């Protein structure tokens, strides 16, 4: 018995009459490249992606960010081609490339990358870390306003926050130095939330910082809706995510409902959900910038729990499932003598009635 | 499942096969999988020090 294929079978468009005249791969690299392409296409048979690939929703992710900047491609392309001609004309450039002594200035590359592809690379990286899934329930935005958060450590050093780089709770003891490029007369809202810090509820977050109605980029002059609380990742609980979300306010907003008492040391009050907060203020507020870091427990977190929060420090431990053994049988034929130890609760001698 | 088959470049026999194939032709083979049922573990509250 046979069944006809449900669709076009592989290797079907190949004309087998002119096999000798057909072009061959001849190289492993050319086959692999085509092989990788075929693996990505949708198929009517069972595939690995079906069972292991994450089940993304068919509808596209709603964009809730700022509008893309308008650029003149014609003028931009003209200036770019001219620059390449000037660089290539230099004879010293050709010898350096030919002798493999040339190098690029990383400082300049980052400055240009931050203006051009930075936002999309940050969005791609934010999606990988699960921020859009957790913060906005799948809605994504392009962080078009670069946000530079730095924790002052000592008197001469800074700990920059990028997009997932690790910062310890000790370094984040005090509020960071936040600077972004903003025009005069604009208003912004800056918050800090711990996506994974919440102890009681899995889906909730902790609002570590909230600054509202910030005039321009003068963060110090914003209203302290919620005072700053350093991160307190619990011991043994893993690595947490803390995200700085910059918002661009269309007009002055009132956050009386979101106002937290100063100081706020009640975890019940700190409980916060970004989706609910943004949803109620979505009409007059738009996500603009994004930064986040990864924080694990350190000895300073004990200070936060004992003193600031006036609670006992919760410790967690990674527990693995118990080992599996088949049901014990009265006669374990051909099994080694250690079979019996597998089903033994204690290692100390027992004497029963005696 | 049925997956695209790419051999190891050190595999002399298989590599010779694919280089002689006509362009646009991809080999397929049946693969068997195990979809993990349980997670590696769970974090549990052990103390309140």
């Amino acid at each position: 018995r046979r069944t006809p294929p449900l669709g076009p079978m592989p290797n079907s468009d190949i004309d087998l009459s002119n096999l000798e005249r057909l072009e061959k791969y001849r190289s492993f690299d050319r086959y692999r490249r085509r092989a990788e392409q075929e693996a990505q296409a949708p198929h009517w048979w069972r595939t690995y992606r079906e069972y292991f690939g994450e089940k993304t929703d068919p509808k596209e992710k709603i964009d809730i960010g700022l509008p893309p900047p308008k650029v003149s491609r014609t003028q931009q392309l003209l200036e770019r081609k001219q620059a390449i001609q000037e660089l290539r004309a230099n004879v010293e450039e050709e010898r350096a490339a030919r002798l493999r002594t040339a190098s690029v200035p990383l400082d300049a590359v980052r400055a240009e990358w931050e203006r051009t592809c930075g936002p999309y690379h940050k969005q791609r990286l934010a999606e990988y870390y699960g921020l859009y899934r957790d913060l906005f329930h799948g809605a994504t935005f392009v962080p078009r306003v670069p946000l530079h958060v730095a924790y002052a450590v000592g008197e001469d050093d800074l700990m920059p926050v990028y997009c997932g780089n690790e910062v310890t709770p000790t370094e984040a003891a005090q509020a960071p130095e936040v600077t972004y490029e903003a025009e005069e007369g604009s208003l912004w809202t800056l918050l800090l939330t711990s996506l994974d810090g919440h102890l009681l509820e899995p889906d909730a977050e902790y609002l570590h910082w909230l600054l509202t109605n910030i005039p321009g980029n003068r963060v110090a002059e914003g209203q302290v809706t919620c005072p700053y609380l350093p991160p307190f990742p619990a011991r043994g609980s893993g690595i947490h995510r803390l995200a700085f979300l910059l918002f661009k306010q269309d007009q002055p907003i009132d956050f009386s409902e979101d106002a937290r008492p100063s100081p706020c040391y009640q975890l019940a009050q700190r409980t916060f959900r970004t989706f609910d907060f943004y949803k109620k203020h979505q009409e007059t507020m738009t996500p603009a910038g994004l930064s986040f870091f990864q924080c694990r427990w350190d000895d300073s977190v004990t200070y936060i729990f004992h003193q600031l929060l006036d609670m006992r420090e919760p410790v967690f431990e990674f527990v693995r499932p118990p080992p599996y053994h088949p049901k014990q049988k009265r006669f374990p034929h051909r099994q080694p003598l250690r079979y019996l130890d597998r089903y033994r609760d204690s290692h100390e001698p027992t004497y029963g009635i005696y | 499942t049925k997956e695209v088959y790419v051999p190891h470049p050190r595999n002399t026999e298989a590599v010779d096969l694919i280089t002689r194939l006509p362009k646009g032709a991809v080999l397929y083979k049946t693969f068997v999988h195990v979809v993990p049922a349980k997670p590696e573990g769970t974090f549990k509250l052990v103390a309140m020090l």
């Binding site: 069944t3 079978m9 190949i14 096999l19 | 096969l17």
Partner: peptide
């Protein structure tokens, strides 16, 4: 498998010229 629609998805020797010593 023979009865299934994917029968023969792994065929490859019709795409290669036969080798004769």
């Amino acid at each position: 498998y023979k009865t299934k629609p994917t029968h023969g998805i792994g065929k490859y020797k019709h795409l290669i010229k036969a080798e004769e010593p």
